[PDB]
């Protein structure tokens, strides 16, 4: 997962679907 979309742990509901292989490490709590 890019670490400028990591550290925005929020956007991750949004980001996940951006980057989807890529961000596979989205936050469970916001999920």
Known sequence: ???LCS???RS???C???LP???PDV???DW
């Open 7 to 9: 550290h925005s742990c």
């Open 21 to 23: 292989t890529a961000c």
């Open 27 to 29: 936050c469970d709590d």
């Open 1 to 3: 997962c890019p670490a």
């Open 12 to 14: 991750l509901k949004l």
């Open 16 to 18: 996940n679907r951006l």
